[PDB]
């Protein structure tokens, strides 16, 4: 309920302050990750396979900076809003919501 409510909140009504926090967390994550010969080497090897180039840190910055609340709400809507999830459950899972009721969490009736 709380997980899906957050997806729905971000799809419909992402505000600006929290998007800035999300942006900063990514900027910190990226620079913190690429620290050592090993993660940088992995980044070279993987990037040339996937992208064909190394995408420089300044480019990622430009791509992060572009994202505002409108961008978060459009991009979240494209992937989350009224979409069929894949669900995997393992363990004491009797209270795991029925799939129809998971599916119904993928849209909001007020929106």
């Amino acid at each position: 309920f709380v997980l899906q409510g957050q997806w729905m909140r971000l799809c419909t009504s992402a505000t600006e302050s929290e998007v800035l926090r999300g942006k900063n967390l990514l900027r910190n994550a990226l620079v913190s990750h690429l620290d050592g010969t090993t993660p940088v080497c992995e980044d070279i090897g993987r990037s040339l396979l996937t992208y064909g180039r190394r995408i420089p840190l300044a480019e990622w910055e430009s791509r992060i900076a572009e994202v505002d609340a409108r961008v978060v709400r459009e991009v979240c809507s494209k992937y989350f809003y009224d979409q069929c999830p894949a669900v995997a459950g393992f363990g004491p899972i009797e209270q795991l919501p029925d799939y129809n009721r998971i599916r119904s969490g993928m849209f909001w009736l007020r929106f």
């Binding site: 600006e16 302050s17 609340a69």
Partner: protein, 53 residues
């Protein structure tokens, strides 16, 4: 005491919900017009003129 809800976050949240609030207003108005067969509006809808004379 309702100074609480004044600030840039709350203005943005107003802006996000405004097309939805007005579209619900559109649902309600067309809904009330339909349910009462309302005269003033429904004479002016170019098909649905099933009073005539």
């Amino acid at each position: 005491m309702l100074t609480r809800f004044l600030g840039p976050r709350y203005r943005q949240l107003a802006r996000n919900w405004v097309p939805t609030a007005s579209l619900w207003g559109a649902v309600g108005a067309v809904g009330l017009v339909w349910a009462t067969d309302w005269r003033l509006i429904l004479d002016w809808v170019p098909y649905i003129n099933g009073k005539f004379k």
